[PDB]
Structure formats: C-alpha cells, structure tokens
Design a protein around this nucleic acid. Structure first.
Ligand SMILES: [K+]
Ligand SMILES: [K+]
Ligand SMILES: [Mg+2]
Ligand SMILES: [Mg+2]
Ligand SMILES: [Mg+2]
Ligand SMILES: [Mg+2]
Ligand SMILES: [Mg+2]
Ligand SMILES: [Mg+2]
Ligand SMILES: [Mg+2]
Ligand SMILES: [Mg+2]
Ligand SMILES: [Mg+2]
Ligand SMILES: [Mg+2]
Ligand SMILES: [Mg+2]
Ligand SMILES: [Mg+2]
Ligand SMILES: [Mg+2]
Ligand SMILES: [Mg+2]
Ligand SMILES: [Mg+2]
Ligand SMILES: [Mg+2]
Ligand SMILES: [Mg+2]
Ligand SMILES: [Mg+2]
Ligand SMILES: [Mg+2]
Ligand SMILES: [Mg+2]
Lengths: 144, 258, 185, 53, 67
RNA sequence: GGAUAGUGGCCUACCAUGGUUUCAACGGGUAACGGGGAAUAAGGGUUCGAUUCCGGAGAGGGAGCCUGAGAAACGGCUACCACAUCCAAGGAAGGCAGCAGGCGCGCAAAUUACCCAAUCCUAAUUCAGGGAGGUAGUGACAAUAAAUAACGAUACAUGUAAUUGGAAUGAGUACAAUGUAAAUACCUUAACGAGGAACAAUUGGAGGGCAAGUCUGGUGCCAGCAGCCGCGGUAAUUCCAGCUCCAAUAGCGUAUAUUAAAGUUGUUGCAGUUAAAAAGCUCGUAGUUGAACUUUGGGCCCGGUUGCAACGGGGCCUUUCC
C-alpha cells in the first residue's frame, strides 16, 4: 500500500489523519487558532491608526547601507507599539512626534520586507492626509 | 413567532402566480379560505395579472367592492380570497365565467367556460365521516362539507357539486381507467387515466397514470383529481388537455407558425 | 426588502498581464476594428469562451440526447442569426472552432465600414456615437450592436442626424449665420 | 542618523515640465499605437525596438 | 412615444375610478391641501396625549396658570 | 398522581439502577446564528455565508406576568441589576439591534428629506393609517454600456509636423413636453453649447520575473528604490528629475484576507535510505483489512431500439418454476 488506509470504510481515519496533518500548514493553523486576533498588532485588520512616539534610523541589512528612517508608533486600537517605515525620498519631515498616522502592512504578511530589519509596517497617512499626496505637492499637512 | 404571519414577501409567493420580481417587496398573501395558501390563486392576482382588467390592487378592490366578481356563486369582495382548483369565477359585467384549472405547465390557466357548466363544479372527497347526531358527511378538496352523501362515496372519489344548492348531483369513483387531473408534484397540470394504485400501508399511496399519448407517470394519491372517464371529462379541459409536450416538440409547435 | 438585482461581468482579464504576443494581437485587433481599449477584446473573448464551454459540455453527451439536441440547435440558431457562424458548418464542432474576429466583424461599427457608410472604422465608430446611424426605424449609438443579419440590409442613416436626413446641422447653421454678415449684408 | 532625509530630492535641480500637444486619449490613442507599431513606422533596429538612443 | 390610455364610458365613472392625482393633472377635482406628513403625524401624536376633548382641560390650564 | 392545550421526569411520591462513551461521550474553544446560497474552481476540492428569501433567537442584562385565539410581548406591565433623564427635592419618568440623526468605537459604512402614487398589510374597513414599503439625497461597494475626436486640402518622406478648411456632436445650459403623488434624473427636443476642440485622463511602471530606455542632468552604499533576486561607494538602463516609451484605462495603485497556482494537505494525488519524516523492539484491544468454493451451460420462443445485423428486454423447458 501507500502508507494510508484504502478500505471502503476507512473514511474516518482518512479525515482524522488529514485533520491532524493540516495543523502543519501555516495559514490553516493561524486561521483556526485565531493568532491574528491575539497576536498580530493589527488585530487581523489591514490598516491601523497610531501615534508616532519617536523617529528611528534603522540600519539596513547587508549588503546594503543607508539607514531607513522609520517611526515608532503606538496604536490607538490596542496600545501596542510597532515600527513603521516612512517610504519616500524625504517624507520623514512630514511625520512628527505625537502625529496620528495610518499604518498598513508591508506587503509580506509579517516577515519584514527588504533590507529593513524588524519593520513589518509602513506609513500611509499622517495627520489624516496621504503621505504620497504630501510627497507630491498636491496637499499640505494640516497645522498642529 | 408569537402568532400567524400576515405578510407574504415576494420570492416567497407560489411560483405559479408568475409575479414580477421587481414590482414590490410583497405578494398578496392568500387569506384563510377554502383551498390553501400554496394551492390557491388570490382574486387580486386573477384580476390584475391573469386578466389585466385591473391595473393595480386599488383597482382590484374597486372591481371587487362593486360586486362584479363572484366565486362559486358568491360575491366574494375579499381581495386576497384564496380561489383554488376548480373554482368558478364568474364576472357578470363582461359576462363570462372561468374555471380555475391548471395548464400543462402547472399555472392556473385562464379557462373561459359557458354558464351551462359554470353552474356546477367538481370536488375531490377529502374525507367521509359521521357528523353529530349520526349524520354522514363528505369533506371535499375545497373545504366544503356536504351532509348525507351517497353511501357509496368513498375518499379519493369526485363529486359534482350543484354550486347553487351545494349538494351532490353525481359522483365518480376512484378506480383504474378513470380520467384524472394531477393537482401537485412534478406532473401538476397533467391529465391521464389511472393504470394502477399501489397501496403502501402506513406510507403514501402511489398511482400510475397513462396520458392519451401513452406517457406513463407515477404520482402520489394526494395530488390525483378524478375528473371523469376516458374521453369524457366532467369539466371543460384547457387548451392543452394535459399532454405535457417535451421542450423539443414544444419548440416544433411554436415554429410551426412561420 | 425587494428581490436582489442580478448582475454579471461581461469580460475576463488575461492570466498573464504581459504576454508580448497577446499584447501585439490585441493591439492588432484594436487597430483593425477601431476599439477603445482591451476591455472590448476581453468581453468578446469572454463570450467566445462561454460559447465554447457550452459546446464542449454538449459534445460530451451522447448524440441524439434531448438536452444536447435542444441546446445545441439553440446555440447554432443564435450564432447564425448574429452572423458569427456559417450556415454550412452548423454541427457545433465548427462552433468549437470559432474565433474572436468572427464576433468583431458583426459589430455595428464594423458593418458601418463594410457597407461604405464611413471612410474608416474609427470614422464609423464616431458616426455611431454621434447619433447618425439607424438600424431600422431606430437610432443606435452603441458601436457593439451585433447586427442580426436581418438588419444588415437595413443599416442606413437616420431621418434625424443631418447626414442622411434633412436638417442643416448646428455648426453649419452658425457658419451660415456668420456668413450672412461676412458676405457684406 | 536622521537629518539627512532630503540629501537628493531637495538638492535636485527643479526642471519644469515641457508644454507639448496633448495626446489623443482613448480610441484615438489606440489608433496612435496601431500606426506607431503595425504599419511599419521604422523602428526595427534588427528585429523590433521601441526607444531611441 | 408609447403610453397607456383609458376611455371611461362616462365622466361620472371617470371621476369615480380615476386616481385623484390623475384627476388633478387633468383639471378635474383638485388637490386637497393637507399639512405636510411630519406636521400631521406630530399633530396626531399631540392629540394622542389629551384624553377627552381639549376645552375642559384648557379651562384647567387657564385657571391654574392664570392665578 | 399533579400540571399542560396535549405526549413526556414536565414536576411530585414510591420503586428499579439505570442512561452516554475511543463508531470520541463529557468537557473546552469558536473573532460560530443554521440553511437557500457566494468566491474560486479540468476532475476531486478550498474558503466564505452578520446581510435582500426561509427558519431561529433577542430587544441594555435577567426573571415574573396581564390581556389576548395567539406574547413569557418589551414603540405592554412588575421587580432587581447597570446605565440614565426632569424636579420647585415632595416626586415623576425611561429602553433607536424600527426610520432618520448624534456620541463613542474604530481601517471601516449615507438624509434629523418627500410620499402612500406602486407592492402589500391592518382596521368597524373601497375612503383611514403604515420611516412596512416606495421616491429622491449622499454614494468610484460592485456591475452594464462607452465621450475625450472624425474627414478633406498644402509641404516632404501609409506616415510627418504649432500649414489650414469644411463638417459632426454631446459634457453642460435651457424654453417646453413627458416622466412623477410632487418633483429630480433618464428618454425626446426650441435656441445656445468646440479649435492648443484648455470642454486639455489618469494610475502605475521602463534590470529580470514582466510590456516598456546602455538617453540626459542630479546624488555618490548618502538620499532613496526594491513583493523577490537586487540597485545606489563620482560614467546608476533600478534612486531624485526631464524627455521618451510601456501596461491597464474612468479607472489604476497599496494593505489585509481568501481562492487558483498547491501533486506545498495529496480520496483522486505528495513525501519518509541520504533533502523534513519508519516508532529501539515485539505483543496487543479498538479501528481498518482479510484465500477459494454453492445455477453454470445448453435450447426454444416472443419481442422493443437503432441501421437481415447489432444491441437491449421478457417468457418456457433443461433435476429448477413467479
Ligand atoms: K549593512
Ligand atoms: K548594495
Ligand atoms: Mg416555527
Ligand atoms: Mg403519567
Ligand atoms: Mg457559519
Ligand atoms: Mg456570535
Ligand atoms: Mg446567515
Ligand atoms: Mg458578529
Ligand atoms: Mg430573517
Ligand atoms: Mg420575542
Ligand atoms: Mg444598545
Ligand atoms: Mg420581555
Ligand atoms: Mg424601540
Ligand atoms: Mg415589537
Ligand atoms: Mg477631460
Ligand atoms: Mg526614470
Ligand atoms: Mg521586456
Ligand atoms: Mg512535498
Ligand atoms: Mg532526514
Ligand atoms: Mg526500525
Ligand atoms: Mg483487533
Ligand atoms: Mg473473499
């Protein structure tokens, strides 16, 4: 045989074995345990708002250089602190301490992107206006 | 939930009514009455959707409240009155009568009839029982109770009802070889002759029916309505006589008009 | 609430976004038939795929099956009525072998060109859009119209739309009004 | 090490755009592409090129 | 243009059977000017509070808040 | 026996010691209301289903109850709990998970608009009522169709450019009419309403995956880009820009989840010597699985479907019966 039961009345063992072995898949285990709700600072949500507490210069991983200008952000939803990249040439001058920022994921579902170590989030908005619209001269950051 | 429902949402109405989907949120809920909710045709539907006399429910009520419409010989000014199978709907204005019979597709077809046979209607004997004071009576499919029935009348028979006095004039017996209408199931609207009756004590009785074209189908005893003998129906049959043409021959019939 | 309203997509995007041969073929079709974007080609391909799937599901049944016969002859009937399919090849295995240009030819924008009503396919598209073409007694401004092979003989200019009608136009009226003075009086 | 966050974009010479005729958006642009690619406006450069040099 | 038409056998039946909005359109018996729906509902809700007729309570109102 | 509308440990009295469970009871979790269905799908599947229909349940949490045919009702009452409102301090009054609307929460969701004209419902009822429902407002949720140009003449090599002309028209605007319950809008139209038609299409990209630059300036492992591999260290096809080109296009990008890809959950259909994985070994209950053998084969018929042949079916004997 092939190491699994073939009998016409072995459906119970077949389905229980599949149930037991589905726990070795990352996504099935995460979904069935609800890790994203307990863990995962974004409590299973695509975006989250937070308050910038400090600007950070994070040294890029090898073989690169050029520290990446992230921000430490405390989420309003749960109080958790995360590090969020501020993507563009500049655009850290648009982000200030105690500013409210919308954060999104980095496109990798965790597992920090690129040469930035330990940064799984990126800044999309600051003070309610788009970071891209601020990098472009379309909009201006509200006074605070 | 806490009591009887009074509304009927659209898409929950019987499909036979051929009601427009995007007309409103509701369909006319058949009031309590002789036949059933699912097996009936509300007078509003018969007057606005099948005959197009009234344009809306308001005009349906205007028709009914001036005593034009008459169901089984009685005025029946109720807009959602549950007229059902083999009921006679006579309009004195536009003087004409209809018999509510099923077309081949299972919808309540508009079946124009003359007064000489609109005088009566047929009723399937739902039960035969002894009433109070030892008086026998017959309960028919339309909820009619008729006292002192012929002692040879049994359940699943048919009785011709005078519809002026509401008495038994004639009665047909459920037996092999008698003409039957099918009043439910997949074969609803089909007309044929009884071939055999399978008993199934405790279960549901089955009956085998052979239409004129020799098509043989089996259906439950609940939805077979005796309407006479072979070639001699006690009622005027609709345009199709319950033949159940397949879709291919239906397309051929349609394209024979070119 | 009221019954839900059914709606469907009429197109399907390609699986590979940047296939060079597919892109070139799509631009060729767009140029040949005066199409606005790749979505029209996507829509035609979606309809063609639906037709082919139906034909395959019919062919997988034994011949002289009632459903196969009914739905097959219905499919050939519709396709020959629109003009896509050939009268000779009504066997549904030549439905399996249809192509996108067969549907692109039966467009009203294509037919307005093929009948000489316009000087280019894009001119034809413009003429349809600007309410200049009627099919019967009906102005049609939809370039994707799928002429039913009975309207081919009847495609002509509108009674309105002063190219086949009788009106003087609008910019012509303004030009004449200014030329009344431009002539000196 | 912050405070260098604009070492390039800020000190990039601010060349303005160039006013040119608008492009024929839509079916007309599909026309432009068809004429620019399939009616042999010479860009062959061996087999097929799409940019000059 | 395509529309729908009715020809009543007499103007009496036309008045009896036609909807009032169509009659007002045509020029027959005109629109009855009732208050706006909100005001009418508020009025009936106000009237729901007073139990009998309002005059007998208006007497008490005047007596009390007149000293 | 009581109680119930009625069956029933539903409850009571006496009695018996039963009832469920590895074929998973019982317990725990569910960011679980169930289903019709939805997304994706060669086949098999995976995931979703608060939500237009059906069923259930609830009306801040519980409990109790009146009326009534029907409620353990909450736009009914009573109590406690938690909130919370007026007050002249004596008292009194509450329940938006109906429709709007507000606060809060958040990534995340609209008008305190009009009307019973349609759909239907209720009532003593053709007439009244109905935030049920419909109408419009907001609305790039999603879906359908498809403007942003078309055609001539000059000059050169079908194309070319700020060389020009006659046409075409809707985007709007608006008499009217229609549409409407009254409107709005669509449909239809008086007149007006194109010339860089400025009435000017964007969003992402141009090393590979992956369609599109060995072009120019800038910066110089900085700034930044880059899903991944990578690009940047003074000649950057990758950053910041200009030009040009590409892709989709009234849409396009980003994040998250999910599906296919995934034969990376494998029943179909995986792998286990060395890549992760054969239990140190044997016994053994449940489970799964388990050698062969009992009417076969002649014949005579009738008879349906395809075009005498084939294929199906029914019946008689043959030690048999249906
Ligand atoms: K480094
Ligand atoms: K590097
Ligand atoms: Mg129930
Ligand atoms: Mg008992
Ligand atoms: Mg569920
Ligand atoms: Mg829940
Ligand atoms: Mg649900
Ligand atoms: Mg929930
Ligand atoms: Mg429900
Ligand atoms: Mg309740
Ligand atoms: Mg609440
Ligand atoms: Mg309660
Ligand atoms: Mg309430
Ligand atoms: Mg309630
Ligand atoms: Mg524009
Ligand atoms: Mg560049
Ligand atoms: Mg390439
Ligand atoms: Mg493997
Ligand atoms: Mg190993
Ligand atoms: Mg071993
Ligand atoms: Mg064992
Ligand atoms: Mg065996």
């Amino acid at each position: 045989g092939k190491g699994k039961p073939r009998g016409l009345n072995s459906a119970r063992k077949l389905r229980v074995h599949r149930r037991n072995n589905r726990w070795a898949e990352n996504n099935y285990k995460k979904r069935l345990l609800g890790t994203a709700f307990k863990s995962s600072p974004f409590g299973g949500s695509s975006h989250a708002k937070g308050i910038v507490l400090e600007k950070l210069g994070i040294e890029s991983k090898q073989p690169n250089s050029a520290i990446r200008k992230c921000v430490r952000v405390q989420l309003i939803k749960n109080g958790k602190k995360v590090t969020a990249f501020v993507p563009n040439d500049g655009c850290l001058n648009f982000v200030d301490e105690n500013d409210e920022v919308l954060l999104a994921g980095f496109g990798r579902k965790g597992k920090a992107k690129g040469d930035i170590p330990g940064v799984r989030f990126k800044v999309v908005k600051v003070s309610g206006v788009s970071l891209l619209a601020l990098w472009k001269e379309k909009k201006e950051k509200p006074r605070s | 939930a806490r009591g009887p429902k009074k509304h009927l949402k659209r898409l929950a109405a019987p499909h036979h009514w051929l009601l427009d989907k995007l007309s409103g949120c509701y369909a006319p809920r058949p009031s309590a009455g002789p036949h059933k909710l699912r097996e009936s045709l509300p007078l509003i539907v018969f007057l606005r959707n099948r005959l197009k006399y009234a344009l809306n429910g308001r005009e349906v009520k205007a028709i009914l409240m001036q005593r034009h419409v008459k169901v089984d010989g009685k005025v029946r000014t109720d807009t959602t009155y549950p007229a059902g199978f083999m009921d006679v709907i006579t309009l004195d204005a536009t003087n004409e009568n209809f018999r509510l019979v099923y077309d081949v597709k299972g919808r309540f077809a508009v079946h124009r009839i003359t007064d000489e046979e609109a005088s009566y209607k047929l009723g399937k004997v739902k039960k035969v029982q002894l009433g109070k004071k030892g008086v026998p009576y017959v309960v028919t499919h339309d909820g009619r109770t008729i006292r002192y029935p012929d002692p040879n009348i049994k359940v699943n028979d048919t009785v011709k009802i005078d519809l002026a006095s509401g008495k038994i004039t004639d009665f047909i017996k459920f037996d092999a070889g008698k003409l039957v209408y099918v009043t439910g199931g997949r074969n609803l609207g089909r007309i044929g002759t009884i071939v055999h009756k399978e008993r199934h004590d405790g279960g549901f009785d089955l009956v085998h029916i052979k239409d004129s074209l020799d098509n043989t189908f089996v259906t439950r005893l609940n939805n077979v309505f005796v309407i006479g003998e072979q070639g001699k129906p006690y009622i005027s049959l609709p345009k199709g006589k319950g033949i159940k043409l397949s879709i291919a021959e239906e397309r051929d019939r349609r394209r024979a008009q070119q | 609430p009221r019954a839900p309203r059914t709606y469907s997509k009429t197109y399907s995007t390609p699986k590979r976004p940047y296939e060079s041969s597919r892109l070139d073929a799509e631009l060729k079709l767009a140029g040949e038939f005066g199409l606005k974007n790749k979505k029209e080609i996507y829509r035609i391909s979606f309809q063609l795929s639906k037709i082919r799937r139906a034909a395959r599901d019919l062919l997988t049944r034994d011949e002289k099956d009632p459903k196969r016969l009914f739905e097959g002859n219905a499919l050939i009937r519709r396709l020959v009525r629109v003009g896509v399919l050939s009268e000779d090849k009504k066997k549904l295995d030549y439905v399996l072998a249809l192509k996108v240009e067969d549907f692109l030819e039966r467009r009203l924008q294509t037919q307005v060109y093929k009948l000489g009503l316009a000087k280019s396919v894009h001119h034809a598209r413009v003429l349809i859009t600007q309410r200049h073409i009627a099919v019967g007694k009906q102005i049609v401004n939809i370039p994707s119209f799928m002429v039913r092979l009975d309207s081919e003989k009847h495609i002509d200019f509108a009674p309105t739309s002063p190219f086949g009608g009788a009106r003087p136009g609008r910019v012509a009226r303004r030009n004449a009004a200014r030329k009344a003075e431009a002539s000196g009086e | 090490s912050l405070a260098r966050a604009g070492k390039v974009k800020s000190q990039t010479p601010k060349v303005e755009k160039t006013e040119k005729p608008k492009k024929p958006k839509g079916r007309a642009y599909k026309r432009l592409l068809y004429t620019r690619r399939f009616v042999n406006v010479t860009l062959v450069n061996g087999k097929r090129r799409m940019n000059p040099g | 243009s395509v529309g729908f038409g009715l020809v009543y056998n007499s103007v009496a039946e036309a008045k009896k059977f036609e909807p009032t909005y169509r009659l007002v359109r045509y020029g027959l018996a005109e629109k009855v000017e009732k208050a706006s729906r909100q005001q009418r509902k508020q009025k009936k809700n106000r009237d729901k509070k007073i139990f009998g007729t309002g005059k007998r309570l208006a007497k008490k109102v005047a007596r009390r808040n007149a000293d």
